[model samples]
Target chain A: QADILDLLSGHTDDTTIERLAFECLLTNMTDDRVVSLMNILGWQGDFNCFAIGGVPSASLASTSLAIRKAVRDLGGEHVVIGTYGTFLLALACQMGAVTPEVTCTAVMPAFSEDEPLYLSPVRSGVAGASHALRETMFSLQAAPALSTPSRPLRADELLPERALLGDDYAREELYRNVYQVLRGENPDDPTYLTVSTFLKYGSSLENTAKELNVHPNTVRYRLKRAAETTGWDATDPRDAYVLTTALAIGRMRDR
Target chain B: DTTIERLAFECLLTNMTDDRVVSLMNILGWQGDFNCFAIGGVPSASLASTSLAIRKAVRDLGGEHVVIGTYGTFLLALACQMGAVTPEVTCTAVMPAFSEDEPLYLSPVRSGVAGASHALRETMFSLQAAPALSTPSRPLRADELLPERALLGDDYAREELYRNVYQVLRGENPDDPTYLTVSTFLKYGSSLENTAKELNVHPNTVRYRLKRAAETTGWDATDPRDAYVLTTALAIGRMRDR
Candidate 1:
């Protein structure tokens, strides 16, 4: 496992196989091995984590244990727990929160183990941790509510809320991901034009497709494909709110 | 000196009220004397004050304690959601500061003893426009930023528009149809008859509502300067956000 991670290390060699390799290692993985393997997979990951909150009076160690089991049950690889943050795996384009939705559900911003990764999981973990502590903001500490989010939560959803709280990384990641992606500003392949039309036409696949002069299926295909490529789906109303705010942040960043 | 100075406004201010002048006096420690003018609390030289003058026609003056309170209010409300036992600022303000030398009045931090005029403008612009703005960036007057601020961006900017325009309009009369009437008047190119026809109201009624909207919000529908502020507010009101 160490050899595989060492080989896959660095941005140059990152491919789908590294993620698949991480998934393979997680099947029946133990707690000790989980951290080392996660850091390895972390080399090539843009993670969106869900905080499993059920273990009462649980310290990081015990909670880490339960989360590992939950990750296994939920088909996730890499049950990550650290002073900085946590991330778990789940099928993409689906609501990633598992049952018994616990006391808090934080979805960290997309991050990697790269020392200079534009957004780091540890910071996102802090955002999540801080958000969890803000129970009065929600009813019964379920601010997002169980099963309310369409996909895994990204801290950027609370960006206007966070930026007001002075989280610099929250502002930058919000700028890097949603706003730039929509504005064709991302270094990665542009996802803005499609998402732009998607939101403009009121998330109507048919209307957006018609205006873009494409078939509706193509719009649906792109939305899902976007879900696959970028960590979030553009179709969900809840998800779209975060995406729109990201675009707003991007515009504000340059202005 | 503006009302802020005349009124003795010093300390934290929101740059959106008259007390902003007073706050600038205190903030700059106004041991005065310099031929300086400012826009959005950004100071510039006499030769360049004309460029700065563009932003002055629409300045929001807030007092020191008032502005500080607004910041504190903004912070506390945000922190309620952030929930810190030992709290910290959630919104990181990246204020733009500028002087006369540069092509753009863009400085990352505030420095120099700005004259009374420019000192306050520069300071308030920094505090109010940070978080949603870029540093060393151009500071547009309310008129310049008005159109853009309406397009469903910047939560605080939107709230400012809402509080100034819609809230004022509604406070006088919850059934204040003047909002709709002024909206139609502006929509119909300031034509009373066209607006009246659209609203199924008499031209006299349209004119009266237009006057009422103008009077209530300090933004008249007939004048373009006032019209711009009103239009921006209307646009924000219609964005349908949570």
Candidate 2:
């Protein structure tokens, strides 16, 4: 790995070796090391390189088909899939999908810690994965209490357990309930009007007042009342954490 | 001969509207039916002579009702030679002589007394008569002339006609048309309401189109009557062959 990094750094044009280095890192790193690296980089999968290793050139055809299927499954059926499909195919080529035996020969440079390529792709991927997971969890929590035999975990369940809280079902439910109150929806009955108004105004007292045609004091009083009922506070960091989770869950539920 | 005289008479009538006064000064010369040509050193003097010749030719051609105007002096001379300007016609040249520094002075009709004038007249008439000319040539009814047949008729000729019209429009006006209404009148017809209705647009749209056309074509619409007359002539020419 150190030899590969040195080789990559020796190249005058870093672009040629960048992807190969990342692939090398992914292949050589331990599971714990990968998790630590991901955490440090705030990595979240958003269909970027960090989310999925550079697609091997050998797997171009299958990888392209896979991307198409993924997009379709994700309800992006109406999307005009073009270059992105080819891009996945190209990535598959680089990932040794087409030529599995040649993985070692297909060496490239790893992204430096300081490089945008190192940070951005991982961050985006992690954020996307978190969002997807949060959304699925929220939806499950908000689902009508039907006595089904069993329920399958969504795509987010594919993520490593360490990436999320262990009590997925309970956390999701808590997030959904909190989100409902923050949105100003009737805690007893779910409706969008009040919550939507609150979300639109970004929980800002002045903006909410202007939108509701009420005084700032009125907005503050209502917000306080909501916090009291939900056991959530507007200012507390822990409450904020829960609120963010709830908001993410709410967005996922909407999707 | 009489047609030329009539054309010249028409030219004089058109000139009557000019801000400058037109006076007849008979110079005494010892000549019995002598056709003498003199090249004046002064640009304006040379232009005046060419203008008088145009007027005479128009009158002689019996085109007394037609206006004879060559935008530049060389064009006026060409018009006189082409018989487009009659013996009695007089054309006042407002343009300067040809020069590299002043390329605008270069007339489309570079040379050949008859060739250049014919081309200039054709260009002017096409511009002034586009609307009228366009009327008949308006893609014969769907039942009359098939689209395929129209395409086969002569693509080059059609293109040339449009090109000529564009040139004339550009020559006439070279200002922004934010407030102009000449092109609008030509395209939509004389009626503002009809123009608005035909386009299935607002009256303001009509106004805007005219202004845009003026700006694009570089024609001034502020001179209300000139704009109307030029537009009318172009329409007439456009309708001529069709």
Candidate 3:
């Protein structure tokens, strides 16, 4: 009978192994399965996971390769690099990718029984690193020219993501329900622009009209339609909070 | 894109049966771990963008899924059979489409689609109580952090608490000094003397309101057991308004 290990058995390329490793990890496979697969692929003894982004789309694969090499050159013994969607993922052991930290910026310290070994559980460590990356990216989307270091996740910033993550509430639906009207695909649809301008310019109809180069009557009609379409009225305080949050989550998704 | 129309939406995860569906999944380089997200909705012109936006968002999250059109009843039945529609989950798992004026009745927790359908059928057979034996926002499991979860879910408890506690304490608005004083008092270690200092009022004034609060709400802040009840009610009331 043929098994995955038998198929691989020393003949697989680096890219194939890396892709397979990622597929296994993403599936949330059992730790034993991951260990067996990685060991068969010639990786061993505890590793840390690092998520890399903020690079050009075309450069993603190249950057991943560069990071893997850098880790090995800097002192890492074992390194496996792969790309998941837009983010670059790396698992390195023995040496902590030392100077690569200067370039990469984020780290989730995974550990084994001993402290310096850093030979930690693979699955949990990878999951934590990716979650931290997401949290950092979300907050960063909310700052600077000088390579913003991966900052810590703040409690306040987690609210929108938490709401979205909730199983009991279909926050995605609520978000889509409201945002589809406020930020639909139509470029000519002045509703988003009008409503946002109204909010930014102190909810004044005349000011919004002047800013958008439209009549006050036009602004009034647009606001009315915005309210009609999204259920949450921009003019009202309570509804405005809901609209603002919907926009924030919508923007988060696009990012 | 320029056109606008009313639409409703529903999305779910299901196994791939079609070669065409499997091919799309392969083309996307999606793994076996990823399942399809079958989408269905009420007929509307704007449904095009609605589903597309959802599809894009789901893809961004690395969820490899397809959006296929299907009839609403069939989708609902399939969703129920798959246990997508259940008390333990939100109704949006099966149907996320509805106007604000007539939102879907998802306040109660039902066992599953079969259970929900059974309740509905029973109601139809004999015009008695409708389905939804479970209440809104109440979990299937106990909320260890919030001991008052049961009380919060019950209509009678809410009204009793509201009338005896919330209504009396909420003097005017959400920020009424009376409400603020009592809440502030509880937070500052239930010291009437300390609460006065925080609110910049005389200790006597704090005492007066605490007495009034106890008189109306039947929970005395001075007593340990009563203080706990007052604090929970205050927290629940504020959360409800928030």
Candidate 4:
């Protein structure tokens, strides 16, 4: 045990697997599984949280390979992976996309879900990971009737429902992401409400205009303005998809 | 500002001035943690006698301040009050100067603020994180394992501290009296007299106890690294009850 600690302590290796494996090695309590907790306190300050997926019993090497490929493919050279009991978890930086589908794709390569990917954005460091993991698990467990598992679920959008379902991450996501968009994104005059209302009414300029008691052109103007400022254009389909996803994620009032 | 705040400001910011507090934070780096520490056996008296290097170099001069025990006591209490604590009881505190670089710009201010301000928190985070940089041959920062684990809310962190407080201190097996001594010393901000007062003993009694604790742990409560380890152990011990 002392030797293992010596091998891993005070050094950061080149690979995430190396770090993760090193931690597990140092702990030296291999899956006795009465219940256990591990440490993710090492280098890499930019990192936030980790996520686990697939079989609880997947091999560490396979899990590392999948996460590495996905993170590498996603262009993040910095990430770490660990194994605890039956699952493999990853401590990572901001991957810029909802993470579940990416994780699932890695774990289940046969998965080619054309459906939307559901990722819970993490604002805090590793401390926030377990909390997020719970939300992701709950969202997955309560997957809607006939919900497609292929694409991502847009966990942020699902927050309102998840919050009702008792997801803490959902509640936090609603608070942090929504407030950030409504206020922090643009302190001058946040356009979050306008965007939400516009999307809430199916991008109908006149209907949205009437509901908000603004002119149709005004609605168009806000959408265009929002698109321009946020860089999420309502005029384009794919772009609209992502913007709506964010708005939906950030749309809850009960946070 | 409370006495602690004034103490913090005088020691950390005011001595440097708020303008330079912001400036130094910009250069030395800002946004880590706020820890409290005094110069000598008596923080004020020690300051009067050029005890801590920070008094000579960092604070650079004399000024008014708050009083919250000392630099570390405020941090300990700050953790207790926040109801979030280990190295959180490990802090995201002001880091000290580049000790590894041991550059001309190294400054370590023990915390004295009970309140949490951006300036305080930022400065403390920077200082506490000071030892954390990677310099190849330079030794690691003092805020190791326990601090980050506690900060990250790792359940294992509490246990790690729990293990160490007993392991090094000799746990229930009291061949040594160091068990809770270091924890108490850190909680009191390395104040010999204060720790003695809390321990219901004389300052010399506390002094011997501290020496006794140090000998066993092989850590001098006066030394920064030793004090940090002691603080982490203290924080972990606190968590066990929580």
Q: Find the candidate with the highest lDDT and give its number.
A: 3
The DockQ scores of all candidates, in the order shown, are 0.05, 0.00, 0.01, 0.01
Better by DockQ, candidate 2 or 1? 1
Write candidate 1's Cα lDDT for A6-29 as tens digits: 544544443344343434332323
Cα lDDT of all candidates, in order?
Answer: 0.42, 0.34, 0.45, 0.43
The predicted structure with the larger lDDT, 1 or 3, is 3
Question: Which has the better DockQ: candidate 1, or candidate 3?
Answer: 1
Q: B65-160, model 3: which lDDT tens digit per residue?
A: 332333322112111112232322423433444222211222222233223322222212111111111131211111111212222122333344
Candidate 2, residues A178-245: lDDT per residue as tens digits?
66556554454322333344543444557767887877776666656656766665433234334434
Give me the runs in candidate 4 sitting further than 4 Å from their true place: A1-37, A40-49, A52-106, A110-125, A145-157, A183-203, A210-214, A227-255, B1-242
- Residue ranges of candidate 1 with Cα displaced over 4 Å: A1-157, A160-169, A181-190, B1-242
Residue B90 shift from truth in candidate 1, angstroms:
36
**What are the TM-scores, per candidate, against the unseen true structure?**
0.35, 0.18, 0.30, 0.30
lDDT of 4 by residue, B61-144 (tens): 222121222333122112212112222211222123122232111112433232223234333333333233223122222224
Cα deviation of B226, candidate 2, in Å: 4.1
The DockQ-based CAPRI class assigned to model 4 is incorrect
lDDT of 1 by residue, B113-179 (tens): 3223223443333334344332333443342343233332334455667787856765655576877
Instruction: Give the C-alpha miss distance for residue B83 in model 1, angstroms.
Output: 49
Colliding residue pairs in candidate 3: A46-A119, A111-A120
Best-to-worst order by lDDT is 3, 4, 1, 2
lDDT of 1 at B102: 27
Error of 2 at A105 (Å): 95
Span of 10 residues, lowest total lDDT, candidate 3 chain A: A110-119
